[PDB]
Design a protein around this ligand. Sequence first.
Ligand SMILES: Nc1nc2c(s1)CCc1ccc(OP(=O)(O)O)cc1-2
Ligand SMILES: Nc1nc2c(s1)CCc1ccc(OP(=O)(O)O)cc1-2
Ligand SMILES: Nc1nc2c(s1)CCc1ccc(OP(=O)(O)O)cc1-2
Ligand SMILES: Nc1nc2c(s1)CCc1ccc(OP(=O)(O)O)cc1-2
Lengths: 318, 318, 318, 319
Amino acid sequence: DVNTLTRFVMEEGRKARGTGELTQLLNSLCTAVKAISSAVRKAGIAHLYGIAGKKLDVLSNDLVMNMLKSSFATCVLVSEEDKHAIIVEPEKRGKYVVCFDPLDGSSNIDCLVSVGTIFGIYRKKSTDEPSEKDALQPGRNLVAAGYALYGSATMLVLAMDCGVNCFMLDPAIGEFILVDKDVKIKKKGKIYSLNEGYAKDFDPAVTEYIQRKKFPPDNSAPYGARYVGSMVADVHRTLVYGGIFLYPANKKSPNGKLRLLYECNPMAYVMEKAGGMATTGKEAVLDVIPTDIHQRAPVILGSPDDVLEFLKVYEKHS
Amino acid sequence: DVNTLTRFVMEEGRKARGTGELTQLLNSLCTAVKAISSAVRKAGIAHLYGIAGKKLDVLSNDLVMNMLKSSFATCVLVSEEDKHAIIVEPEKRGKYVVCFDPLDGSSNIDCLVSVGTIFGIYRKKSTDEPSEKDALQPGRNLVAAGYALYGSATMLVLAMDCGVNCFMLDPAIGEFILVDKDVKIKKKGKIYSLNEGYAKDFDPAVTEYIQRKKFPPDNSAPYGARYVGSMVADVHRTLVYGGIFLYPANKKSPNGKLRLLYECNPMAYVMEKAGGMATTGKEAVLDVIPTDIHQRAPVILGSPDDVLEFLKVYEKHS
Amino acid sequence: DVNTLTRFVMEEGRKARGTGELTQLLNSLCTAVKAISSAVRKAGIAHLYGIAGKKLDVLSNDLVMNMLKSSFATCVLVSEEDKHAIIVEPEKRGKYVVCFDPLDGSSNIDCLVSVGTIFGIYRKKSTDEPSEKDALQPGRNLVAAGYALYGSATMLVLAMDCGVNCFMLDPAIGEFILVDKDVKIKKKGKIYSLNEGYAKDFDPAVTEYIQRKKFPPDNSAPYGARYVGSMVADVHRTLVYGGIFLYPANKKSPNGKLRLLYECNPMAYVMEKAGGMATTGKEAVLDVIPTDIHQRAPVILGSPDDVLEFLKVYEKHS
Amino acid sequence: DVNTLTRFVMEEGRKARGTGELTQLLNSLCTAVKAISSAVRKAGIAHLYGIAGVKKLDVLSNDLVMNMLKSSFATCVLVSEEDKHAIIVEPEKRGKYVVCFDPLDGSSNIDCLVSVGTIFGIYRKKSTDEPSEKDALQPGRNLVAAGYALYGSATMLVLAMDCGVNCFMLDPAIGEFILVDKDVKIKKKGKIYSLNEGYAKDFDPAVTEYIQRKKFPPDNSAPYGARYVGSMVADVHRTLVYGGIFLYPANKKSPNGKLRLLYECNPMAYVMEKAGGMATTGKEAVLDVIPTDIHQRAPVILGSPDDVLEFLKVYEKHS
Ligand SMILES: Nc1nc2c(s1)CCc1ccc(OP(=O)(O)O)cc1-2
Ligand SMILES: Nc1nc2c(s1)CCc1ccc(OP(=O)(O)O)cc1-2
Ligand SMILES: Nc1nc2c(s1)CCc1ccc(OP(=O)(O)O)cc1-2
Ligand SMILES: Nc1nc2c(s1)CCc1ccc(OP(=O)(O)O)cc1-2
């Protein structure tokens, strides 16, 4: 029996026996994602080059912003693109808080590298006037999270309490088709991913760990290396093929470079729901209690045995 | 003035003052590429999952094979997908030889990583009955070469004697729009690309070179690292942002890992026509005379200053 | 504030405060319509003609049939394509009955004339085992009805108790965009539509009426004539521009030619919810009590003043 | 062996053994047609309705054709319904062809989603002087190529040349026109007549009698079915595929007809004749009319030969 994102979402919403607000939020998000995908694949670029005789990042943010606001299901919106949290106008306020990166990896979208949209959805816990404080919740409180990868094909990975599900966007009918149910990451992978250009500033634990991947002390086969530079792409590969992804801290970046609210938490949530792990080295990403909507957080995620091994090395240096 | 791949090709062909055969070959290749793109983005996948109640690489190969044969411009076709060179039936024989990889990086297509089509076009040099020997020409004899990158967007890079030109596929009208005329690679980049998981087996010169990128002896800023795993993606990034890409021999693959005819030569041609370099370490990729259609070849390409620097290190270890 | 078919449907469903079944049904139908649209515009026809080396009406029927069944919201399905009503297997039964024409006007599809999908939704009113009898309800009992016109662009007209709304399918993102809220037909039009090739067999009332349109009683300008041959196209034009559409009974077809359950009723419902009228001449189409799922019914619909005028002539001949 | 518009055009151009200019012209036209199709199917309409928080379709269509032809470097004079005057291509972009076209026929009624299309006729500049409106004033008999794009349930491009008529289906998945009907020929006789009967009151006697014969056959044969979409491209295409007759004659009010000779009548007349059909004004073949004004009107009766001949018999009976 064929399944679409819309049908899947409506059914889960029906089961929750609530107001149906989250369903509207997800539907709106889904539509925004297809709009972003269309723009990312350069639909209509011919008109830009004069066939008939301005930024993807900003457009992507506008799409998500507008779709979520008009869903009447949100009250506070945090975007990697805005300095301050956006407070939805009173007449369109819903009970959910959404943190997202409209177009992750857009910094290098010129080489046509894969890009994506990352998002995390929380329920406003407080009754107070909606404010940026409502987005300051530990990833452990997530109701739903996931991402859209605009790669060779467009896929939406959605994670909730019930697990992780992957949907493929069929451009012929603009429909997200369920192609992978209750996804689980491999217990152990054969691929490690991180920018080794930072080697000189690597934390000792990171240096030793990568060294064990290249020169396994047990003379087993070394891990292969992959680093796209776009978190969505690297994390998705990690989920599908298993392995480990790192963007750790160092003397010069005590807290890392990726952002906790809309990059680390959503990915940590997906990973844990898929049987994987996500750590800052000192603790689970999802347990970090944020104080700033844009605060950074180090992150090591992927296959459990691989993350556990990293933590072993980390511990050795603590 | 807007320009399309079709218009551009027809114009160049008109100037060459020939039979117009290459024009038909390129037109057919262009069509095959759009077909591949449509399938790679998963058009119609809903039907595969039962909305109404072959493998991508095989389909891709069929598309190119069929379009080239029916162009009446080719006589010998070598594909990464077929063990033997395909000899075009007599009634459809043209004077060109085409070596191509229908879907480069398809091995890791499950993670939605970028994939592409690489191609190299030669003029049949020998007058003997067409055979696999017609494809055994040094890259230096290429009439045209290039690739299609199916990434965030689909782009076709075409290289000829007159230079390199980039076209963006506008999905709205199925037209390749010229967006970058006479492209030239940066003299020097800030990114190095290669699978460092092979560190253990790297040749000494490669080890030292990478070491210089991470720990500049001149204490300048270290190069950033990126490795997608898909040659088309990695090479395209190198072209756009400059830098260097490597896939040198391993102690486990003494003759390199990438294939000379449909991976190395085409990319080397694009690089040289863009002002860059491509070497096996011992010589220019384009000068290697092939003896086997699927023989491997090491390859170091990218910005001239960067490749020259690698060659300096290489020499120091020779 | 932008609105989509999905968002609109979910909102109306949320207000009805029911099980959410009709929502799932409509969502499923919407997806089927996009699939039909894609096939009607000939997506992938290149493969049919050998680029790489079933009938549209059958496919359309399969799409609707499969999407409805898998919605878990239907129990009885009547299609212009099937002699007998389809009874949904027990494990997929819902409380709705759907009568539809998968691809209206497909008989003359070879000329690329507009085609469409017509549908009428009823709630099973009985407590017995689902059967063909559940589809034999007067149009007056419709819960929702409408159609998809596959013309210059694809539009879905949906009618319910709250009125008529028009959605435009945006091929770029496969989303139905609301472009016309609470639509109302003109009180009086200037166009009449019917196959005048039947003149010889016309009922006297029809002859006189058409005569009044060509040679106006109040020396008013004559009505313009338009007859596409596809009910969906002709009816949609009547809705948008006002006027009147006819397919009356004659000497050989005393019960008309169009089918009551999936052609006449749906259109009559749309018309009345838009402030228009639909009559068989003797009574309102929606009041006819069917005895056979495929029975025919004459039909005169469109602007109220126009239909009333027809009825005046009709009565003069009774 | 699969064939596309591009491959087909390039091959015919290669055969002609010329400069390759017409090939570039056709390529450019093909591209413009796909862009028009995309817009007609409402791609991106969501942005117009605020999904992220605008010119008329006929204007845009005209701009696309205009821009693509000019940049083809193959044209010198362009006539479109949109501009009162013929456009003279700037010297540095001049080619030897003259193109008359209707960017978006039937756009007067595009709100009801009725079929619309693009009609075009290509001539070779036959003068030695400075390009001017006068170069577009050639009888349809001089056409080098003509055809149309129908934006209906699907998008098809009908191309006619000396070698015959060929139909291409636009595959939206790959933006390619696929040849699906080679050397098309219209039925010798059809069973459908098409014209706006709302003008009955002003019909010329010959037209009145002819329509009368289709509804009430003399030999008591089966009457013809009636079809009138209101969009010339749709009505004409139906006529080509199913055979029959299409009419938009002159009457009392409209003495020289309503349709335009250069970009509506001539192109369709050329397609019809190359397909074995006919196109007459009643007094003579549409293609033989020598124009004096780029926007002059001309009556037109076209379709299956036997049907047109029959019309002409009635017409003569009233002359
Ligand atoms: N479409 C989905 N809705 C929900 C999903 S999926 C998971 C759990 C959930 C919990 C509460 C809830 O409350 P509202 O219905 O938003 O009031 C909604 C949902
Ligand atoms: N469309 C293009 N054709 C050519 C290009 S681009 C570059 C150089 C070239 C050289 C010879 C040639 O001879 P044929 O026409 O193949 O006989 C054709 C071409
Ligand atoms: N999506 C829509 N649902 C309804 C609409 S639109 C109009 C009236 C309606 C009435 C009852 C109902 O009950 P279930 O939800 O089917 O149980 C559902 C609906
Ligand atoms: N692609 C096509 N070209 C032609 C076709 S089809 C029909 C006859 C023709 C005649 C002359 C000609 O001269 P240029 O090549 O325009 O100089 C070109 C053509």
